[PDB]
Amino acid sequence: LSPSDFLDKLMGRTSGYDARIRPNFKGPPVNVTCNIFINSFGSVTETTMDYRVNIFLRQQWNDSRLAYSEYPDDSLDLDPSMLDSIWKPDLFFANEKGANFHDVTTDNKLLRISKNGKVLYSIRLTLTLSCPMDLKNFPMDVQTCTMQLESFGYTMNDLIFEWLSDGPVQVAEGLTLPQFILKEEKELGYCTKHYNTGKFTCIEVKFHLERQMGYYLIQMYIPSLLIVILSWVSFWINMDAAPARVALGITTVLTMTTQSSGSRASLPKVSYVKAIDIWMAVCLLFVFAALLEYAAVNFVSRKFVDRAKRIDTISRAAFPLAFLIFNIFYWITYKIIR
Amino acid sequence: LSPSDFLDKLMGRTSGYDARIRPNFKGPPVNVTCNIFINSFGSVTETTMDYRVNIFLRQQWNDSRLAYSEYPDDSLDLDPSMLDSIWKPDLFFANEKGANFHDVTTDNKLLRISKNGKVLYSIRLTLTLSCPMDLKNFPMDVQTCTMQLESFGYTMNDLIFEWLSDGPVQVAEGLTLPQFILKEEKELGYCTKHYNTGKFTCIEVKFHLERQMGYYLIQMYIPSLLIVILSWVSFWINMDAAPARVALGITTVLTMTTQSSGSRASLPKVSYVKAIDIWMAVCLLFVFAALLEYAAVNFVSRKFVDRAKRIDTISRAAFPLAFLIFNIFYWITYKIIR
Amino acid sequence: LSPSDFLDKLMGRTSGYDARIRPNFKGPPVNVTCNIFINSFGSVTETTMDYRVNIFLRQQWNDSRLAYSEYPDDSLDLDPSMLDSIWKPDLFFANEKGANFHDVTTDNKLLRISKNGKVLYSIRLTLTLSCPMDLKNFPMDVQTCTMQLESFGYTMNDLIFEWLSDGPVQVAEGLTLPQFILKEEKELGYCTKHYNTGKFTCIEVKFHLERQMGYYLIQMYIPSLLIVILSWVSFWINMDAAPARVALGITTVLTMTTQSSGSRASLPKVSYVKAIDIWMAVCLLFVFAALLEYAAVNFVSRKFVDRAKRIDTISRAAFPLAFLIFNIFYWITYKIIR
Amino acid sequence: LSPSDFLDKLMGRTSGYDARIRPNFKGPPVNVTCNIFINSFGSVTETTMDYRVNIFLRQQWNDSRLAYSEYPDDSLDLDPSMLDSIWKPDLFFANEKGANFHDVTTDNKLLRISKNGKVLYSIRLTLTLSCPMDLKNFPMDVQTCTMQLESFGYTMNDLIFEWLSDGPVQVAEGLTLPQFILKEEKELGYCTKHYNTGKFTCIEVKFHLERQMGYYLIQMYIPSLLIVILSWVSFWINMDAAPARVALGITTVLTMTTQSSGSRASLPKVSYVKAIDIWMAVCLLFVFAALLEYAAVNFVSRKFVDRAKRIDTISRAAFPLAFLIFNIFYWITYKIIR
Amino acid sequence: VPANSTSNILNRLLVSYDPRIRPNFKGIPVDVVVNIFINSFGSIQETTMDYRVNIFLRQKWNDPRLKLPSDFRGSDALTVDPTMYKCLWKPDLFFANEKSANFHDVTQENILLFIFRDGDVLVSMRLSITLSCPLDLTLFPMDTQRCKMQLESFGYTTDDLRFIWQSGDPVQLEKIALPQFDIKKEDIEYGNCTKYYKGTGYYTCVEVIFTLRRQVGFYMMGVYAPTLLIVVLSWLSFWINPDASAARVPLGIFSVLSLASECTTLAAELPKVSYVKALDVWLIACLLFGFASLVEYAVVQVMLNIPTAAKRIDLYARALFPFCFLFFNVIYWSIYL
Ligand SMILES: *[C@@H]1O[C@H](CO)[C@@H](O)[C@H](O)[C@H]1NC(C)=O
Ligand SMILES: *[C@@H]1O[C@H](CO)[C@@H](O)[C@H](O)[C@H]1NC(C)=O
Ligand SMILES: *[C@@H]1O[C@H](CO)[C@@H](O)[C@H](O)[C@H]1NC(C)=O
Ligand SMILES: *[C@@H]1O[C@H](CO)[C@@H](O)[C@H](O)[C@H]1NC(C)=O
Ligand SMILES: *[C@@H]1O[C@H](CO)[C@@H](O)[C@H](O)[C@H]1NC(C)=O
Ligand SMILES: *[C@@H]1O[C@H](CO)[C@@H](O)[C@H](O)[C@H]1NC(C)=O
Ligand SMILES: *[C@@H]1O[C@H](CO)[C@@H](O)[C@H](O)[C@H]1NC(C)=O
Ligand SMILES: *[C@@H]1O[C@H](CO)[C@@H](O)[C@H](O)[C@H]1NC(C)=O
Ligand SMILES: *[C@@H]1O[C@H](CO)[C@@H](O)[C@H](O)[C@H]1NC(C)=O
After folding, report:
1. Which atom number of ligand 6 is nearest to the Cα of residue C162?
2. DSSP symbol at C95
3. In angstroms, what is the span from residue C83 Cα to ligand 5's centroid?
4. Where are the domains of chain A?
């Protein structure tokens, strides 16, 4: 009668239940229809190659030992602290770096039970998962950050995970990201890892993260354009102002180097070229070419005024054109192809 | 009586109390009248999008099992160590990133029981809550950081939260924030989240944080203005000082770029533009136009000197005027729209 | 008689002691004579507004349930592990952010009992307390960082704290702070906070932290003085060399701005102005006025040439005088008046 | 007899051993011979004034209740899990800021026992000890960072520490430090702290750390030397080339200031001067005096140009001489004296 | 016979099992086999000299007290609820070159526990340890470091406990990717060190030595090519006419200052070390080259007070600076390949 004695007879001390034994011992495996509801997605640090999530994990399985008839209500809810007495499928995130629960006023968990023995195990988790990034096209990098569920103590012969059919993964209505644009497309794959000790099940969900061009543009693409335009207008200045144009080119080169160094500093040390670095290098080369143009002018000067002016105007009318066709190539290969 | 025996007969092993059971089981839900008392508010960092608070949470409810008559004292206080044996309603802060209690010389909890069974469970806490911010108008941003109280294990049919009528949210006498001006208008709303499982209750309080413009002003709006004034004084100089004016405009562009870079690096990457970014870029364009005007002067130098000086005077008379009207427009549209 | 059986009769299961009950229940409150022995003091960061301590906290109270006669030795020292069995008064530091014990080879504690029952419970701690600062005069500030020893569960009706008469607060022989010069006069007061739940007692101590000016001086004030003297020496040169003087003043302005930005970024964000900011702004204005002086010289020059020479002389002979009177005013009103 | 029964009879529940009571209760004190084995030394951050270590803290003593006759094996090793059931002497590191064990696959400890009862308790640790530094002679500093073992609960009448006769402190063959050079001479003495509670014992060991100047040299002494050499070469240039020497001196002063700011910032904010600051300031003054010399030249010139050439020659001949005698003074009195 | 009876009569306080006593007490030592699995590798911070690895530490031994009898044939192996790993005997084991090691408990202690018929045991436990490997940076951007992971024992001597690697395939790692370095799956050298701590006795230890071959990509892109551009700009400075006196010194000056700033940045990105780094060699060489351009202009100016001498100086410089720089670059790469 009393819920106290009821639980003591169902799974408590006087029940006979043994959490150290999985259901259907010496029998078929357990199917765990897992689903999650993300709550906070962010902290995507390209330097550490991680992304933090706070998820209301859920794990539903069917163990017959919890079949009852005293209480007629199908769905039943119990105290989280009732959890250490029943079985739980061993579950970890193979791509985790720093993970923890959340305990504030209680252990944030949920134990729900049905009349047919089916169970529901919802627990809160904060995961500093690890997704390696591809930065060949850095500002327009459509990445695929993963979340690899998997079993540790049990194998695929005794424990089989599998996503939920309808609405397996959800997100909070009202979410947003500062740098990225999370997509509704979320592919579901079976990693099903295999070690030497045994065959272990494993689930994976792949989030698509497209980095948007706003900040990187306004911070690194426009300043360099202005710097190269300064190096350009340095053309129309007279041919006798050597300190003028040389200091101009020097300052442009210095600020370009600092800009590129900062861009790299915000990112991890990587060998393969990054589009942003291509842009930094090409603009640096443009300002260096302007400096070399003035140097050629001053070398030809020592009637040479005519040839020097011809060079100056040819450059002032060509360099913009070449820079523009190059900008076309760059944006059309990094926004369309890649 | 031996008050130890009183406690043991009220809730101890001999009483018959089952903390694993919510009060009024299989009956009406529970009404938890929650209220808090803040003690520390700060660490508002837009880079991580969080603010750290210290609160004296409180949870008053009515459990019909803790009604007694032996001791006449209406309001009774007890030892926290016994607080673990009584029912504690589940509760978490959904928008939290990292939480923790504060145990120093004991566990910082409180238990106060009335005669009719009413309870008070006051506990200290520390929450690194999360509040997304809109920096479209950053130095004048009026943000709304929230605190979503909510239950996890129990549904809204078995656990209902709600603020207290009088004195629901308090603050410490003498509180003050470095960069912000906290307000006394604290909205109270019903988030009442609804996941797939069921209707989970949720309480939310919204703080309004009006950023003060002092530091950002004195650090970005004053020096940039001085730089623009340098680019201006580059006008009254005569043409013979070509290197003077070119180096001047160049250095001004450099320092403007560095100012923008730092101001944005101290803040998170975001696509949408920020007023401070507007000022950075527009002062950059101003010094750029000053340098370009000098270049046009030196080019027209090749009778010509008359028109060159005319252009110089026209620029010296106009550019400050355009900058002034723009300064007006900007401060008006970013202190009137707010 | 035997020590094991003695402790068991005193507070063990054989005794009858209940740690869940304060002494003198349903009677007068407990008078706790709390005194602390600091061991380390530092980590004063204006960024987070905290300071880290390491104290041998001590709490002496008189409970009559621990009066023994088997051993005539008055003072008795026991095993820390026996602490949990006796009563303890709840306590916390209201102005703390992170607090931890020090468990190394044991739980660092002390338990010394006398014959009358006068208990002594010394515990080790490390506290990241909080003390908001007034930086209206930053390098020459006289701050007051505090430590609010206060109870949480028990009210002023059942637990009353009070400092010790002689030697309540000590300091380790040989202490010293890197940036500050701690004082020996430590003000003691009663905070005695009153929340809505009840009247919770609270004890306060106020530390006078006087910041010394050595570093800030040699790192910010002297460089700025040299920059302004650079702007000064920009005077003796003739007028025919524009690029020299203009580049000089430009670079002085820029390095002054960079110095001020760095200094402020080494400190928290604040609306009001800091003395260091006053000095930065004044030196900036001085170099800017040197540049404006050169500009007015160039204008007056293009017999006004003697006029420009007189301007240069008047500047070179007055600017240092104005700077000296300003230095006098600044230092005398920030070292005497404040 | 049986090993399990043997343990249960010696120190287990059925033995009769009381861990809460030190050996020789109400008798002569306990002599603890402590010795350590350092394993990883480093992380000496001058900003926090601490050095992190990792030691196999060992503690021997003699308690007669642990004498047996069934096992003739003199040295008997046991299971760490059995450690929690015997007596352990209270111990802590007074100069510690943050400490922790290392629990991996077990809680790393050791319990060895002799026939006479002599115990050995080897445990692993990781201590971020604190040593206040004297940076008056900063790059050549010879710092003495301590490790203060000490008791907290038991007085010097019930617990006495004392270093091991021979081989009290060891180091791992193959150890090395990046910044410092640990010595083999390690002082070993008593500190014997004395609080108001009583006379507590103490053991302190002091490592003499001698910083090596490679990094600081190659990073600050060579570049600043190059800067002053630039300010020197500015001499041989002709006098009519104002912008050359002016901009050169300017940029030299600016880079000197930048370097000195970086140096001062890498270390804590300290009042007393640091030799590195002496060097930065004197090099700054050298280049500033070179610029002042150029200015005096330009003032004297406008056969005053002959006197200007004389001044330039006198400067080119005297600057290196004075810089060299100062270099002598500096190195001789900061390396040979200290 | 239910399974609860099996687990009970096998390992619990309800049966005659004592975990505080290793197998073969006062007899033959324990031969512990071991085998690692590198799941994640990276987060190397040369400033602190550490590298983070998330692994599965597998260790199998023989415990005769655990003996699944032939009474039942359920399997030759057997898997048990991880919560029993704390009941039976676990061998003392610690990574010595460790600074921070934490388990990974999420929804359960991430622990395996197999058992066999003859008594063989196998336990795997996830770990994320922050080891330490003293780096050799005499040649930094091309170094070949050897970061190690030496298991050990603390509460058991070599006379009772004994570690040995797995005969075949002890370490494993699949699709491993690091941004900077590149592991060699073949150079996985492992051996014994058999620590001998004074005062206690001989203790066992088995070490893995990962050979990390850093690549020169990011550095070539960030510190090399910019300085090369700076130096060729310093060269360019020569082609200007010496009559300027203000259009030729700024190039060298700002080149010197930019190289000094690069040196500052590199020293602030890396740990402070006494010995010299090849990167600093290259950088100081480029700095001296800029300084040489500047003193070349100076010698020209002195020779200007003359035209033939100035032309000779400038031409000899334009022809000497690049050749010497190229010879230096050749020798530098041929030395620090
Ligand atoms: C688990 O699912 C498999 C197939 O997916 C099935 O063969 C097995 O019977 C299931 N286990 C149960 C129902 O306990
Ligand atoms: C558990 O019982 C339900 C009852 O219909 C059944 O549908 C389901 O297949 C069983 N197993 C699992 C894993 O849900
Ligand atoms: C709790 O409040 C709800 C209304 O929200 C209602 O069920 C009733 O007023 C309360 N039920 C109790 C106290 O059982
Ligand atoms: C508790 O009981 C009182 C009646 O004594 C009732 O009015 C109240 O709604 C109940 N619940 C709470 C939370 O007070
Ligand atoms: C404890 O006993 C002493 C004995 O003189 C008395 O003075 C004191 O008031 C009592 N209470 C406390 C809290 O010390
Ligand atoms: C505690 O102190 C209060 C005054 O602070 C006094 O009224 C009361 O009698 C004291 N109780 C004791 C010493 O037990
Ligand atoms: C501990 O050492 C002291 C040294 O003064 C000695 O007097 C005492 O007898 C010793 N106690 C022992 C060995 O139990
Ligand atoms: C313990 O017993 C040994 C037996 O020789 C004796 O030498 C020693 O002094 C005693 N005390 C200690 C601390 O070792
Ligand atoms: C490991 O190496 C040590 C040192 O040579 C040796 O004593 C030990 O026997 C070796 N291990 C095995 C299994 O041979």
Report:
1. 5
2. T
3. 21
4. 1-212, 213-338
